Nucleic acid binder design. Structure first.
Lengths: 61, 81, 79, 212, 86
RNA sequence: AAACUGAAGAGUUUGAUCAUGGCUCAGAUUGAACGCUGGCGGCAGGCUUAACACAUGCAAGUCGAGCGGUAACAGGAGAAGCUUGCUUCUUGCUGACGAGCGGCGGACGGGUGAGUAAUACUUAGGAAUCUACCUAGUAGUGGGGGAUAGCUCGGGGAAACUCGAAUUAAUACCGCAUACGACCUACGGGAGAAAGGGGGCUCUCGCUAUUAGAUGAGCCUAAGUCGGAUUAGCUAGAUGGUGGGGUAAAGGCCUACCAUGGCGACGAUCUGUAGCUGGUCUGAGAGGAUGAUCAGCCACACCGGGACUGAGACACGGCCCGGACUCCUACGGGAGGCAGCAGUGGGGAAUAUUGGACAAUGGGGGCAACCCUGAUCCAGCCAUGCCGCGUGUGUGAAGAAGGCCUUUUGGUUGUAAAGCACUUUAAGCAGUGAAGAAGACUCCGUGGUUAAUACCCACGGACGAUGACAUUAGCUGCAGAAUAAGCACCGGCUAACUCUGUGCCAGCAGCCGCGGUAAUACAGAGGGUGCAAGCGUUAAUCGGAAUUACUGGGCGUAAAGGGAGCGUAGGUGGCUCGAUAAGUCAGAUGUGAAAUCCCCGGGCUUAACCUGG
C-alpha cells in the first residue's frame, strides 16, 4: 500500500521500517494511509513547534 | 455434601461475606443453591453485622447439610445476641 | 403432562401415526402472527385412526427413536 | 485541578464579575477592565452564535464555582437523574459544595481561598446525627441538611479568617446559612432556593448545551 | 506419571484390572453355557446351566465387576426364554 | 411514597431556487495502540495476534488410630573404648519419618474457546435412571484359607528398569453360614453380604444389605436460535415393527427378519462463519452491534484412537497404541507435553513479577497435633479506564522591565509580575496506632451416655496460641511555596486573530477548500479558546441516518409497477342466530439464578467502590 509522509522534510528511504495509520489524502489518488512521524524510524519534523505531537517532534527545552 | 459457607465479595481490603448453601465441591464464588444471610466483618454498632434465616438454617440442618465452623460460630453468636 | 391435538397426516407406518400441529407465533419485530405447522410422530397400538383424523396425544417416554407421543383418544372421524 | 491563571481575565471574558476576588474595593476601580473582551482585539465583528452563548454560560458557572468540566458533567448527570428541574438541581449541588458554603459563611474571603482552606483540613464538617467532628480534606463534599461546620483549634486565630469575616458581614449572610462568629460555627439547615440564588445566571442554557 | 502417587495408582490399577478381567470372564463363560443350552433347545440342559449360573452372577454383582441391575436383568431375560421353551 | 425524564442539526449539485439524493462533521464509547507530556492516591483492568515451540521453579497431597517394618533424625536404656567428662553400639523402647503395601483425594479447584449450526445454549416440562462424602432409619459385622510387595539370594541393563527362587502382614484377596430390607421367581421357592482400628464389659471411627431425603451426573420432549437458492431435493440401519443382545437407564444403541417408509420452499441437504447465556456499548423508544473482566451451561487438554480404575473420566499435571516435533543414549533403546502460576523464544500496534502466606473465606487427608493448596488473600509494574486531590491563598500601579501589535505613540501581556503578609492538603521526616480474629489448646461446671464420677458428644464459663499484608487504615506533630503543567486548536461547520517568512513552491485538509507578492486556512512569534495529568491522531461499534422507514420512507417526471392475463401454495375476506374458547384480555401459582440496569436507605473524610430492601 501507498502512504503519505506529512510534514516538511523526512529521512525515509529504501528498507526503512515505518509505522502506518489510516487517513486518506484527498488530492492523491490511491494514497489511503499516513506515515506516523517519529514512531519507529521516520524521524519527527526538525523545527516543528505548533503541532509537534502530530509530527513526532520532541518538546524544545 | 452440602455445606453452608461464607462467599467472599466486597472490595479489596474490605471483606464482605455472603452466607450461602452450596455443594462442597463447588467453589466459594461459584454457584450456590440458596442465599440465607449476609455477614459483615467490620460494621458500626448501630448497623446489623449479622443477619440470618433461622427457619431455612434449621431446614437445611434437618436435611443434612454440614455447616462450616465459621458459619456455625456466627450462628451461635447471633442466637445468643 | 402436555396434550396436543392435530390431524394425522400419515398412517402408513405400522403401529405408528404422524400428526400435524397448528400453532400461532407472533413475529418479534413485525408483531403479526404466522401459522406454523410441525409434524409430530405418535404411537398407535391398534392403528385405530386413519389418515385425516383429528387426534389428541401426550408426552411419554421414548418408545422409538423418533416417537415420544401416544394416542390417548380420537375425537372426530373424517367423512 | 484548580485554575492557576489570572482571575480577572476570566471575568473580563465573561463580561461580568465572577466573585473570584474579594470586594474590598469596587470591582470597576480595582481593575478598570471588563468593559470590552480581553486581548488585543477587544471589540470585534461577527457576533457569537447561540451555541457560543451556551458555552459562555457554562464557562461562567464553572469559573464562578471553581469546578472543572469533568466534575461539572458529573453534577449535570446527577441533576438529570434527580427529580425536578435539572438546572435547579445542578445549581443546588454547586451551592452544596463545602468550599462554597464556607465562603458564604465568610470563613474564607474568596472561593479559591475557601477551597485551599478546606483542602488543608482546617475546616471540620459534622454530618447530621454524628456526635464527633471529622476533618475533611475534600472541598467538593456534598452537604446534607443540618450539617455543622467548625474551625480546628489550630486554625481558630487565623488572621485571614478574621479579615474575611468582616468582608462577609459587609457582603451579607444568606438566610439558609447560620453563622456564629464567637464560636466560628456554621450550620447548613436548608439548601438554597432558586429564587434565592442570583436571577441573572441562566440555568436553561447549561441544560441546552449538554443535549447535543 | 510425573508423581510417585500417580505411579502407585497406575500399578495398583494394573493389578486390579487383572483380577477384574479374570472375574468378568468367569461371568461370561457361565452365561455362554446357558446360551448354548438355549441354542440346543433342551429344557433340562438349560435348567442345569441356569442353576449353575445363578450364584455366580450375584457373587460377582456384589463384588461390583457387574452391576446389580445387569445381573437381575440377565436372570429375568434368560429365564424368559427357558420358560418359553417347552 | 419512590423505580414512570426522554428526541437539535450543519457543510456540500445551482447564476439563484425547491425537492431528491449521496458524502462529511459535531456525541458517547473501548481489554484499545501511536505522538507530546507526565506529581499523588483509591477501586477496577492488563496477549483481542501464533489452540505456535516451550529452558527453569512451583501448581496433589495426606494418613503409623489398616499392616509388615526401621533408610535417616532426635532421643531413652544400658554396653559405658570411658578418651573422666570424652563417649559410642544394641535394641522400634519412645517422638517420628525415607521406601514398600492398603484406604481417601487426584473427575473439585484452575486454564482455553480450537472444534460445535446442534448429543451446544436459553426457556418450560417430563420418565426409564445411578449417585462417593452428608441427614434420618432398619438388619448385621461369624467363622476360615492360600497368596504377595517391601524384605532376602542370585542375575540382566549405560540408563528408563526388568527377569528368576523363596518368602511376611493386613480394613489387600477368595470361600463357607447367616438375610430387615434388596435381586430372580414358573411366586412353588431360589440364590447374594462384611474388617477391623483405636479410648478407658462398654462408647467410638470404619465396613456389609438397604428405605427415605439432600447434592450431583446421565436421558428425553415442545419452542427460540447468523449469511448463502448463483445450494432443490436429501436419506437404505434409512422410518417403523417383532424376537434377541447392550446400557445404571428410554432408545437402531446393536443385531436377524418384515413393511416401505423418514425430512423438504414453514428452507431439507450442501457450504461460509461462530462457543451459548445473564450481560456490555450505542439509542427517547423500537432497534443495531457485540459475548473482555464477574457468574451459569458446553467443548477441549500436542494430533488420532482405545479402554482401565473409580460413585463419578473415556481423565490438563493418569494408562495403552500410532503419529509429528524436542531431548538422552555406551547406539540395542528410553523421556516429554505451561490453553495451571510466574517465565523464555516467536508473531504483533499491544498487554505484567521466573513475588509473599496459608493470617482470613474455601478444598483434600487426619481422631487430633498438623501437612498441601500459583484456588484464595495480598504484594511488584503499566495513566490502561473511573473517581478524588495537588501543583499554592490573599494584598498588590507612574500599570516596573522585556515580548507582541501600533496611526510611534498608545494598547496588550496584566493583579499577571516584583514587593508584601499568610497556609502546609499531597510528597518527604518523627512518632502513635485500630480492624480484618473466628478464642484454639489447656482448667472448670452441666446434661446425654454407660456398670460406671471412666471415655466420648453437646452446651456454658476462665484463659490468652495465632496477621502475609506491615515500616498498615487512621491520628499527632517537624521545615518551608518550598517537590509538581502540559496537549490540541483559532476560515466556516466550531469556542478563539493579528503580524513576520513563503509565494499553486514549501506545505495543510474530516467536507467546502487555502498556497500564483498585503495568507484570520502553509511554517514561526504574540494573543486567545477548550480540556487539564492528561491532550490529540488512528482503529472499531451505535447515533445523527425518517439513509432498509414495524414504531418510521417511497414507486407519473428525481431509483422504483412485473409486457399482459391465468392460476398453485399462501395472505385477506358480506349479514343474522347459536355451540367452542384456540388467538385476545383479566386474575391466581411456579418460574423467569446471583451480579449488573433503575429507586430508597447504610458504610467507607467525598467520589469511584461496597452494600440491605
Amino acid at each position: 500500500v501507498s502512504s503519505y509522509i506529512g510534514g516538511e522534510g523526512h529521512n525515509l528511504q529504501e528498507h526503512s521500517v515505518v509505522l502506518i495509520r489510516g487517513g486518506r489524502v484527498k488530492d492523491l489518488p490511491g494514497v489511503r494511509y499516513h506515515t506516523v512521524r517519529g514512531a519507529l524510524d521516520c524521524a519527527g519534523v526538525k523545527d516543528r513547534k505548533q503541532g509537534r505531537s502530530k509530527y513526532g517532534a520532541k518538546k524544545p527545552k | 455434601m452440602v455445606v453452608i459457607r461464607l462467599a467472599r465479595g466486597g472490595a479489596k481490603k474490605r471483606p464482605f461475606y455472603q452466607v450461602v448453601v452450596a455443594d462442597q465441591r463447588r467453589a466459594r464464588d461459584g454457584r450456590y443453591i440458596e442465599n440465607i444471610g449476609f455477614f459483615n466483618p467490620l460494621a458500626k454498632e448501630s448497623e446489623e453485622a449479622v443477619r440470618l434465616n433461622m427457619e431455612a438454617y434449621h431446614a437445611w440442618i434437618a436435611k443434612g447439610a454440614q455447616p462450616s465452623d465459621r458459619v456455625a460460630s456466627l450462628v451461635r453468636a447471633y442466637n445468643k445476641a | 403432562a402436555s396434550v396436543l391435538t392435530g390431524r394425522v397426516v400419515s398412517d402408513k407406518m405400522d403401529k405408528s401415526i404422524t400428526v400435524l400441529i397448528e400453532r400461532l407465533v407472533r413475529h418479534p419485530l413485525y408483531g403479526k402472527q404466522l401459522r406454523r405447522s410441525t409434524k409430530i410422530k405418535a404411537h398407535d397400538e391398534n392403528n385405530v385412526c386413519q389418515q385425516g383424523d383429528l387426534v389428541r396425544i401426550k408426552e411419554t417416554r421414548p418408545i422409538s427413536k423418533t416417537k415420544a407421543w401416544t394416542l390417548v383418544d380420537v375425537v372426530e372421524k373424517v367423512e | 485541578a484548580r485554575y492557576i491563571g489570572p482571575k480577572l481575565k476570566l471575568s473580563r471574558r465573561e463580561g461580568t464579575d465572577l466573585g473570584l476576588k474579594s470586594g474590598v474595593k469596587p470591582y470597576d476601580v480595582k481593575t478598570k477592565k471588563a468593559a470590552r473582551p480581553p486581548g488585543q482585539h477587544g471589540v470585534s465583528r461577527n457576533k457569537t452564535s447561540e451555541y457560543a452563548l451556551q458555552l459562555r454560560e457554562k464557562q461562567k458557572v464553572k469559573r464562578i464555582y471553581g469546578v472543572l468540566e469533568r466534575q461539572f458533567a458529573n453534577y449535570y448527570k446527577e441533576a438529570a437523574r434527580k427529580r425536578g428541574a435539572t438546572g435547579e438541581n445542578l445549581l443546588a449541588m454547586l451551592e452544596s459544595r463545602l468550599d462554597n458554603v464556607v465562603y458564604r459563611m465568610g470563613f474564607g474571603s474568596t472561593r479559591a481561598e475557601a477551597r485551599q482552606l478546606v483542602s488543608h483540613r482546617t475546616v471540620m464538617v459534622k454530618k447530621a446525627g454524628r456526635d464527633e467532628f471529622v476533618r475533611v480534606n475534600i472541598p467538593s463534599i456534598q452537604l446534607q441538611d443540618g450539617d455543622v461546620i467548625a474551625i480546628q483549634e489550630k486554625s481558630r486565630e487565623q488572621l485571614r479568617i478574621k479579615n474575611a469575616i468582616e468582608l462577609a458581614t459587609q457582603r451579607g449572610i444568606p438566610e439558609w446559612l447560620d453563622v456564629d462568629h464567637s464560636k466560628l460555627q456554621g450550620t447548613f439547615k436548608k439548601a438554597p432556593d432558586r429564587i434565592d440564588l442570583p436571577a441573572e445566571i441562566n440555568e436553561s442554557l447549561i441544560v441546552e448545551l449538554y443535549s447535543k | 506419571a510425573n508423581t510417585a502417587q500417580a505411579r502407585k495408582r497406575a500399578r495398583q490399577n494394573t493389578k486390579r484390572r487383572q483380577n477384574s478381567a479374570s472375574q468378568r470372564s468367569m461371568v461370561r463363560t457361565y452365561l455362554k453355557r446357558v446360551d448354548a443350552a438355549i441354542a440346543a433347545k433342551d429344557y433340562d440342559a438349560a435348567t442345569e446351566a441356569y442353576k449353575k449360573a445363578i450364584p455366580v452372577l450375584d457373587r460377582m454383582a456384589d463384588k461390583g465387576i457387574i452391576h446389580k441391575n445387569k445381573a437381575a436383568r440377565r436372570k429375568s431375560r434368560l429365564n424368559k426364554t427357558i420358560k418359553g421353551l417347552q
